[PDB]
Design a protein around this ligand. Structure first.
Ligand SMILES: *[C@@H]1O[C@H](CO)[C@@H](O[C@@H]2O[C@H](CO)[C@@H](O)[C@H](O)[C@H]2NC(C)=O)[C@H](O)[C@H]1NC(C)=O
Ligand SMILES: *[C@@H]1O[C@H](CO)[C@@H](O[C@@H]2O[C@H](CO)[C@@H](O)[C@H](O)[C@H]2NC(C)=O)[C@H](O)[C@H]1NC(C)=O
Ligand SMILES: *[C@@H]1O[C@H](CO)[C@@H](O[C@@H]2O[C@H](CO)[C@@H](O)[C@H](O)[C@H]2NC(C)=O)[C@H](O)[C@H]1NC(C)=O
Ligand SMILES: *[C@@H]1O[C@H](CO)[C@@H](O[C@@H]2O[C@H](CO)[C@@H](O)[C@H](O)[C@H]2NC(C)=O)[C@H](O)[C@H]1NC(C)=O
Lengths: 361, 359, 358, 361
C-alpha cells in the first residue's frame, strides 16, 4: 500500500509549537510526501513561498536515510484560482509552456513527481483537464525515455459527486495518472445550519442526511464505478476537524448551529481545528461515536467538532483494504500532532502512525 | 423504557440443556414477557401446546415476586397460517367471536394483554387488519373496574410488507406498542452471505436496496406516522447462518444454502446465542463496518449474530431516537442457562440490553 | 376553491402604467385579496406606507359591488426583519400586546383577517411561531360579527419548513396556508434555472429534488397539513438572468441576474406585463419535465409562467384536492390589459380563475 | 439519428391479423431493423425458430429497394437462460468458439451486425460481459481488415439501476459497442400492488413514485454519467402497454390492483397489450395524460393500461434530441399497428412513424 502525506508550506508560519517545517517530519512515516503548493507564473511552474527552495531541500533530505521515500510537488491549491488554472489549461501555448517547464523544475529541485491540484475544474474544463493530464504524462515519458526513473504524476480530486460529474472524465484521466488521491473530507452533508461530520465513512442514519453522497463510502464506490482502478485510488483521511458553534442545548448530529466553531490557537481559522488543537479541546469534553458513520465528534460548552481519531482512521484503513484500494492519503502532516506533545502519550504523528500501522496489520 | 421479551413454547422440546421452560426465566429481567403462540379454533382464542396451561402458570408465577412484570399472549406466529387468520379477520361473524373470546381466556390464564402476531396480512387485508385492531382495543376498553388489557402487535420491518399490509398511522392510535421485527432481514444479494439484523445499511454498493436494516425500518415507521413513544425496536439473540460455497468469507460471499443446524435448536440457518458461543471457539469474528454488528466464520460456516457490544449499540440507537424501548427475540435463544458463554452469567445479551437501557 | 391574491402597496410607486392602486383591481377576480404589508411598532400592529389608510379604503371599497369578497392584511414581509419579528414573538409581554392590538385594528380598517408573513422564523423560533399562531387564533375566537380569518404565507423550501414550522399543529389553527411555491433555487450555481417549476423534470438539470412546486405540496401534505387548508402559490412574475455564453438552455452559464424591467426596476425579476414586451422577438421553450416556459433573447433569459402553465398548475392542485390557488401578485400580472396583445386585464389571474371553475 | 427497430420472430404465430412476418415491414421506416432472437448451441450462434432462415431472407430482402437500411441479428433473449449465457461467456474455449462463429453466420445470412441481448448478466458476470464485448468487437475488426464493411456490434441493456449497477461496466463496454439500446420501459411490475406507468419519461409527482430511478430520464442520465457517450446511446420507446386489473373504484396512478390486466386477444399475455390491442381498448375508455410523466394511461371498467401514443413518443423524441442522443429504439415493430387497420387511421406503423417524423422534424 501507499501512504501519501501532504505537507503544507504555509504551516511554517503558525505561532510557537504550531510552526511546522519539513525537518520535523518522520522520514519513515509515509511512502510519498507531497509538498504543497507550487505556483504557475508566466506559464512556468514556480515557487510560491519565499523560502520554498530551502524547504524543498529540507524535505528531500529525508530521502538520504530512506531511499524508498518518494516526494512530489503539488501545483495549484485553493489560493491559486480555479479560473487562473483554467486559463492556463485551455490555451494551447500556455499549456505547452507549463508542461515543458515541469520536468526540469522537478529534477532541479529533487522531486520524484508532480501532483496536480486544480481545485477544481468547472463545467467547461472537463476536456481541458483530461488533455492537460494526457499531455503532462506524455512529457514525463519523453523525459525519461533515455533510461531515467520516470517522474510520477498524481492528482488530488474532489470526492464531491457534483464536482466529479461536472469536471472529471474519470476513466480517461485514470489511464495516465500513477495514482488519484480522492479528497474524502470537507463534505457539506449536514442540512444547512446544523452539525454534521465532515468526513463520515458511511451515510449513516438514512432519514437524517440532505443527500446520499456526502460520505467516503459513496465517493469511493462512485469513482470505482466510473472507472478509476482500485489499484490507483488512494483514499483521503483527514487529520483535522471541522467545528461549529452550537445554538442550543442540543449537541447531537443535526443539532442547530449559529456558525463555524471558534478558531484554534494555532490554526486560526473559524470552523477548522488541527488534531493537536482537538487534543487540547478534548480535556473537559465529551466524545460520542456516530453510530452509522464510524467516526467521532466531541462537544464542550457551545462548541462541537467532527474529527478523526486513532480508532476511526484504523476503521477507514480497514475499509480501503477491504476494497483493495492503493492506500491512504493524509491531509495533512502539519495538522497531526507532529510535535508529539499535545495528545498526552508522547508520540509524534499519532494519527498518521495509526494509519501506517493499520495498513501493515 | 420497555424491555419486551419473547418466550417460545416450543423451546421446551429442545434436547438436554437446550430445553427451556418459563421457570428458567429471570423474573426481574424484562418489563414485559410475551408467550408465543396461541391458536384460533372455531374462532375462539385457544392453547397451542398440550401442556400450554401448565406453562401459562409457570410464566405468571414469576409475577408473584415482581409486581411490575407484565405478561401477554401472542396469537398467530409462522405456523398459524396467514390464509386462516385472514378468513377469521375478514369475516364479520368470526371476527366478533374471536375478539369476544379474548378477554376471558386471558383473565382465566392470567395474562395482561394480547399481542397480535399475524405474519403477515396480505394486501387484501390491510383494512381487515386495521378493523381487527380497532375493534379488539374497543372490547378491551369496554371492560373496567379492572386493569385494561394491553394490546400490542409484532410488525414486519420489511418495506414491501409494511406498504402492502399496515395502515401505520391508524393502527398506531390503538396499539399500546408496536414491536418492529428488525431482524431476519433478507438484504443480501441472492445466494450470498449477509447479516440478518444490521443496524445501518453499511457499504452502499454492497446491497440491492437500502431498506434491509434496522435504521431504515425504524425511520420508515416514524415517517408513516408511528409515534416514537409507541415503537419498540426488535433485537435478536439468535444468529442467521449459511454454508459457504467457496474460500470467500466476507459479506456478500457465495453460499450453497443455510448453515448446519445447531445442536440444540436444530433449525438449519439459525443458531441460539449459546450455540454461537460454542461456534466462536476457533472462529474468526469480524465487525461489519457501518452495520455495527458482527459475523463469525469457521470452515464452511458463516453466521451473522448479535453480541453484548452490538446490542448495546442498538440500544444507544433506540434511545437517541426516543423509541419506547427494546423487544427481544427470544429469551430462550439467549444463554439462559448461563453456562455456555464462559462468563457464568444468565441471559448475557438480554442483560446487556437491560444495562444499556438504564445507562 | 379559494383564489387568494396579493396586492403589494409599494407597487403604487412604479412609473407610468406600472403604478398600481387597489382601485385598479377587478373586484370579482379573487375570493380573497391580501394587502401587503403592515408593520409592528411598539408591539402593536400598525401601518407601513404613509397613505396606507387611504389605500385600505380603496381596497375595501371593492366589497361594495361584491359582498362575498374577503380582504386580509398581511403583516411582516421581507423588509420587516426576521430578528425583529422574533424579538416580539419570543417575549410573553410583547406577544400579548401584539395579539391584543390586532382585532380592533382590522375591524377599524375593514379587514376580514390577518395574514402572517414572518419571513422567516429561524431554527430557534419553531415553537415560538406555533405559540404565536395558537394564541392569535384564540384571541380571534374570543373577540368574535364574523370571526376574523387567520392565514399564513409559508416558505416552500424544505430546509425552512423543517427548521421553522410545526405544520401539523399550526395547520389546526390557521384558516388557510398559502405555500410560496416560487422563487426556488432551481438552478445549479452560476447557471440558468426556472424558479417555479411544477415538477422536478430532468433530474440532472436541477440541483436537488426539493426545489419545485410538487415536492413542496406533497411535503406539506405529508407533514399533516390538510389538503383543504393548503392554497398553492402561483407567480405572475418571472426570474431572469444575464447569459454568459451562446448557450441558452436550462443549466446554461450566467454572469448574473437579468437586466431590470423598465417598471419593476429589480435585477433578476420581471412582471408578466414586462415579459410580454420581452417576448417580441424572443424564443420561448416549454421545459419538458417542469411544465413551465422560459424565454430567451440576446443575453437575457427568464423563467416565468404563462396562461398555459398556470392552467397546468391549477389542474395539478385540483387533482391534489387543494383549497385553491394563491397569486403573487396582482400588480405583477398585466392589470392594465395593454401589454399582452389582446386588451384583457389580468390575463394570468383570469386564466387561474377559469381553470378553477372549469 | 438512428431509428433502431426490433422484429420478434415469435410474432409470426399470433392468431389472424396479429401474425407478423418480415414482409409486412416498411423498408423505409427504420434505419436499423434487429431480428430477435438467435440461439447459441454447441457454443456456435444458431437459428431458433424452424423457419428462421426463410424469415432472415424476407427481412434482408427489404434492403433491395433501401440500400441505407441495416439489419442485425440479436442473440440471447428472455428465454435463453442467463445462466446458460454466463457459462458460455465465462469459459475461455466456449467464448472463443461463439465469437469465431458469429461473422461467418452473419455474412452467410445477410446481416450487417450482431446485437447482444444477454438478459441479464448476473453480479458475477460483469467482467465476463465486458470481455465478451471487447473480444467480439476485435473479431469484427479482424474479419473486415481486408477492406470489407465492418460488422456492427450493439447491445440491448437494462434501464434498471439495480441491474446496471450489478451487471454492466458502462464506461468500458460503450468504448467497443457501436450503439447501446437502453430498454427504457417495463419499469412498474404488478408485484407492487398499485397502478404505475411502465415507461414514464420523468419521475413525476414525487410521492406517487416508488423510487427516483424507475423512469426514462433517470436511466438515460445515469448511463451518460457512467460514461456512455450520448452519440452511442439509443433510447428505447415501447409500442406496447403494461396493464393491471383494478381492485377498487380508484383509477389514478397508485390505485390498488389485484394483479395483471386481462390478456389481449392477439398477444395472449396477462399484463401486456400491443398498441393495436390498445386502440381497440380505447373505444369506450377514458385516457388521462399523467402530468409529471408526459405519458398517458387509459382505464375502462376494472382494467388500467399505461402505454405510449403519438403525442408521447413525440415528446420522448424531443427529449432524446435535446440530449443529443444517437436516436431511438423501438420495441417492437410487431406490437405497433403494423396492419394499419386497428387505430382507425388506415396508416401502418403509427407509433413508429410518429417517432420517425419527430426525429426528422
Ligand atoms: C503566482 O503567480 C502569479 C503570476 O501569474 C502571480 O500573480 C501576479 O502577481 C502580480 C503581483 O501582485 C500581479 O501584478 C499580477 O497581476 C498577477 N498576475 C495575475 C495574472 O494574476 C502571483 O502573485 C504568484 N503568487 C506567488 C505567491 O508567487
Ligand atoms: C388450531 O386450530 C385449527 C383449526 O381450528 C386446528 O386445525 C384443525 O386440525 C384438525 C386436526 O386436529 C383438522 O381435521 C382440521 O381440518 C383443522 N382445521 C382447519 C380446517 O384448519 C389446529 O390443529 C389447531 N392447532 C393447535 C394444535 O392448537
Ligand atoms: C416599523 O416599526 C419600527 C418600530 O419598531 C420602525 O423602526 C423605528 O424607526 C425609527 C426611525 O425610523 C427608529 O428611531 C426606531 O429605533 C425604530 N424602531 C426599532 C427599534 O426598530 C420602522 O420605521 C417602521 N416601519 C415603517 C416604514 O413605518
Ligand atoms: C438452443 O440451444 C440449446 C443448446 O444449449 C438447446 O438446449 C438443448 O436442448 C436439447 C433438446 O433438444 C436438450 O436435450 C439439451 O440438454 C439442451 N442443452 C442445454 C445445454 O440446455 C435448445 O434446445 C435450443 N433452443 C432452440 C429453440 O433451438
Amino acid at each position: 500500500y501507499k501512504l501519501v502525506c501532504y505537507y503544507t508550506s504555509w504551516s511554517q508560519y503558525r505561532e510557537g509549537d504550531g510552526s511546522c517545517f519539513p525537518d520535523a517530519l518522520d522520514r519513515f512515516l509515509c511512502t510519498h510526501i507531497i509538498y504543497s503548493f507550487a505556483n504557475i507564473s508566466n506559464d512556468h511552474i514556480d515557487t510560491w513561498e519565499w523560502n520554498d527552495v530551502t524547504l524543498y531541500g529540507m524535505l528531500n533530505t529525508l530521502k538520504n536515510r530512506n531511499p524508498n521515500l518518494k516526494t512530489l510537488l503539488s501545483v495549484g491549491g485553493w489560493n491559486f484560482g480555479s479560473q487562473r488554472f483554467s486559463k492556463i489549461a485551455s490555451n494551447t501555448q500556455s499549456r505547452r509552456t507549463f508542461i515543458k517547464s515541469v520536468p526540469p523544475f522537478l529534477r532541479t529541485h529533487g522531486f520524484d513527481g508532480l501532483d496536480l491540484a486544480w481545485l477544481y475544474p468547472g463545467r467547461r474544463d472537463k476536456q481541458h483537464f483530461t488533455t492537460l493530464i494526457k499531455e503532462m504524462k506524455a512529457e514525463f515519458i519523453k523525459e525519461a525515455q533515455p533510461g531515467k526513473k520516470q517522474l510520477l504524476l498524481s492528482a488530488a480530486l474532489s470526492a464531491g459527486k457534483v464536482t466529479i460529474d461536472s469536471s472529471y472524465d474519470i476513466a480517461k484521466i485514470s489511464q495516465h495518472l500513477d495514482f488519484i488521491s480522492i479528497m474524502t473530507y470537507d463534505f457539506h452533508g449536514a442540512w444547512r445550519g446544523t452539525t454534521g461530520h465532515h468526513s463520515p465513512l458511511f451515510r449513516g442514519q438514512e432519514d437524517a442526511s440532505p443527500d446520499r453522497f456526502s460520505n467516503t463510502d459513496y465517493a469511493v464506490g462512485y469513482m470505482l464505478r466510473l472507472g478509476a482502478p482500485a489499484s490507483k485510488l488512494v483514499m483521503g483521511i483527514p487529520t483535522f476537524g471541522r467545528s461549529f458553534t452550537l445554538a442550543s442545548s442540543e449537541t447531537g448530529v443535526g443539532a442547530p448551529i449559529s456558525g463555524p466553531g471558534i478558531p484554534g490557537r494555532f490554526t486560526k481559522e473559524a470552523g477548522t481545528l488541527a488534531y493537536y488543537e482537538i487534543c487540547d479541546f478534548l480535556r473537559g469534553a465529551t466524545v460520542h461515536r456516530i453510530l452509522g458513520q464510524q467516526v467521532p465528534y466531541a462537544t464542550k460548552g457551545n462548541q462541537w467538532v467532527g474529527y478523526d481519531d486513532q480508532e476511526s482512521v484504523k476503521s477507514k484503513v480497514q475499509y480501503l483494504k477491504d476494497r483493495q484500494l492503493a492506500g491512504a492519503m493524509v491531509w495533512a502532516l502539519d495538522l497531526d500532532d507532529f510535535q508529539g506533545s499535545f495528545c498526552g502519550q508522547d508520540l509524534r504523528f499519532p494519527l498518521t502512525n495509526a494509519i501506517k500501522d493499520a495498513l501493515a496489520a
